[PDB]
Design a protein around this ligand. Structure first.
Ligand SMILES: COc1cc([C@@H]2c3cc4c(cc3[C@@H](Nc3ccc5[nH]ncc5c3)[C@H]3COC(=O)[C@H]23)OCO4)cc(OC)c1OC
Ligand SMILES: Nc1nc2c(ncn2[C@@H]2O[C@H](COP(=O)(O)OP(=O)(O)O)[C@@H](O)[C@H]2O)c(=O)[nH]1
Ligand SMILES: [Mg+2]
Ligand code: NA
Lengths: 66, 419
């Protein structure tokens, strides 16, 4: 009977810990995924703008050519 | 033959506190522990529940997972009489979870309590065994109480274990999960108690509401019937007489089979200046409406029965009444147990009554009580309702299943012999 008593309470301990663990990991995954995503978006908007800058340089070179 | 009293949880601590007050009065002990009784009878067996500046101290250990209940007792009239070191409580509380008491938050304090018990048991010249008070349907006394019983049994496997267990009732309920706690407690007791006085918080109400005509009985009301019943059963132990009952002999004579150690208390006069007649006391004593368990004796059969009449009265007339009852009600008495009923008379009457009668019966009808609890458990357990509060502590449905089953077996056993 005493062992089972020690088993129950250790089970409840391990239950709580496991929850805290899973919680911590999940939050860490979602923070990094979001962070990557957001930076990607920003990096693509910047690259589009840079490609528009190059087109303007080329338009300026086309006029100079004539 | 000292008796180590032990009270756990709110209910357990409240009823136990009155019990001490009552028996202190009868034994002429005031709150300070000093004695002023006019008769030596009072001091003749006072050591059964007291230890002696020529002051008697109750041999009681108070146990709770929250200070509140124990602090009230300390503030109570006899709060002084209780030994301060015997006060033993924590701060977590048991949130009404057997688990929280029998597993999680009790395993701590239990050791502390076992130490006081050990100290009381050492001083005791001949330890008769242990007396416990608790509410089977709560958290500290339901769960932690049964845990202390198990611990106690391991340390003192040669001592009698007796519990005044307060069966929970829908009429007087605190939480939906009270059936669960009761079923677990029931199975603990089935195995680790030699004697269990089932005091249904239901009946008490009824009595109060109906008979005593109290529309809104409070817990004090019920407790008042409880203290009286307590003094009754404990009379033969407290006061000297022809039958110096003891826990072991009490078990030897009323328990035909171990599992069947659950008794229906009964008291009369259910409170008055008109002392009842010996016939009156005897008809009320066996009256259903005077039993503290909410079971009909007529629906079952008395394995064994024991009566006590306190107060000045005709011993012969007493014996005549008892004989009449048995003869008129022969069908309600098991034939296989010859002479299954016995009576005893004490000269000192209960406090404020010219004479009273206390009834202790091992009736197969007691199964009604366990059937009620089992149905409740079944209702919720079929849908696993509220079980997360226990699974969170580390318990497992299987354990609920087992306890449910055992209580059903016990119900079956009472019926078998009934028929
Ligand atoms: C109602 O009164 C009481 C009776 C008892 C039981 C008891 C219970 C019984 C019974 C007989 C006896 C009786 N047994 C006994 C013992 C020694 C004997 N020696 N010589 C004869 C003799 C007889 C009691 C004397 O001691 C007990 O503890 C016993 O019949 C069926 O149920 C305990 C009590 O305490 C709670 C008590 O108070 C209320
Ligand atoms: N007769 C009686 N029953 C009580 C009392 N206090 C609580 N109860 C019952 O006890 C059950 C709840 O248990 P509780 O006392 O709160 O146990 P705890 O966790 O250890 O305090 C409920 O069914 C109430 O019916 C009391 O003072 N007298
Ligand atoms: Mg409570
Ligand atoms: Na803790």
């Amino acid at each position: 009977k005493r062992e089972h008593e020690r088993e129950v309470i250790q089970k409840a301990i391990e239950e709580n810990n496991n929850f805290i663990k899973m919680a911590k990991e999940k939050l860490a995954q979602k923070m990094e995924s979001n962070k990557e995503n957001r930076e990607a978006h920003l990096a693509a908007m910047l690259e589009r703008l840079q490609e528009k800058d190059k087109h303007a340089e080329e338009v300026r070179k086309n006029k100079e050519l004539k | 033959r000292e008796i180590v009293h032990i009270q756990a949880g709110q209910c357990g601590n409240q009823i136990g506190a009155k019990f001490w007050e009552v028996i202190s009065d009868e034994h002429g002990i005031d709150p300070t522990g000093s004695y002023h009784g006019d008769s030596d009878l009072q001091l003749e067996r006072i050591n059964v529940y007291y230890n002696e500046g020529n002051k008697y101290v109750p041999r009681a250990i108070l146990v709770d997972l929250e200070p509140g209940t124990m602090d009230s007792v300390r503030s109570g009239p006899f709060g002084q009489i209780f030994r301060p070191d015997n006060f033993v409580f924590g701060q977590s509380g048991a949130g009404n979870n057997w688990a929280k008491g029998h597993y999680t938050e009790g395993a701590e304090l239990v050791d502390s309590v076992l130490d006081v018990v050990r100290k009381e048991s050492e001083s005791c010249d001949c330890l008769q065994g242990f007396q416990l008070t608790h509410s089977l349907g709560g958290g500290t006394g339901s769960g932690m109480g049964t845990l202390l019983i198990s611990k106690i049994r391991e340390e003192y496997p040669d001592r009698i274990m007796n519990t005044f267990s307060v069966m929970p009732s829908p009429k007087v309920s605190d939480t939906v999960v009270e059936p669960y706690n009761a079923t677990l407690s029931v199975h603990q007791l089935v195995e680790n108690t030699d004697e269990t006085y089932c005091i249904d918080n239901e009946a008490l109400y009824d009595i109060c509401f109906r008979t005593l005509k109290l529309t809104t009985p409070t817990y004090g009301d019920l407790n008042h019937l409880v203290s009286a019943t307590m003094s009754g059963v404990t009379t033969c132990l407290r006061f000297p007489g022809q039958l110096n009952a003891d826990l072991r002999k009490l078990a030897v004579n009323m328990v035909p089979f171990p599992r069947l150690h659950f008794f229906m208390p009964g008291f009369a006069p259910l409170t008055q200046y008109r002392g009842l007649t010996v016939p009156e006391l005897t008809q009320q004593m066996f009256d259903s409406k005077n039993m503290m368990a909410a079971c009909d004796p007529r629906h079952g059969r008395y394995l064994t029965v024991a009566a006590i009449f306190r107060g000045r009265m005709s011993m012969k007339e007493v014996d005549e009444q008892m004989l009449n009852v048995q003869n008129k009600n022969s069908s309600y008495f098991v034939e296989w147990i010859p002479n299954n009923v016995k009576t005893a008379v004490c000269d000192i009457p209960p406090r404020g009554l010219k004479m009273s009668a206390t009834f202790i019966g091992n009736s197969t009808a007691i199964q009604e009580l366990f059937k009620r609890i089992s149905e409740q458990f079944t209702a919720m357990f079929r849908r696993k309702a509220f079980l997360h509060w226990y699974t969170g502590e580390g318990m497992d449905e299987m354990e609920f299943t087992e306890a449910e089953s055992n209580m059903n077996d016990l119900v079956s056993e009472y019926q078998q012999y009934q028929d």
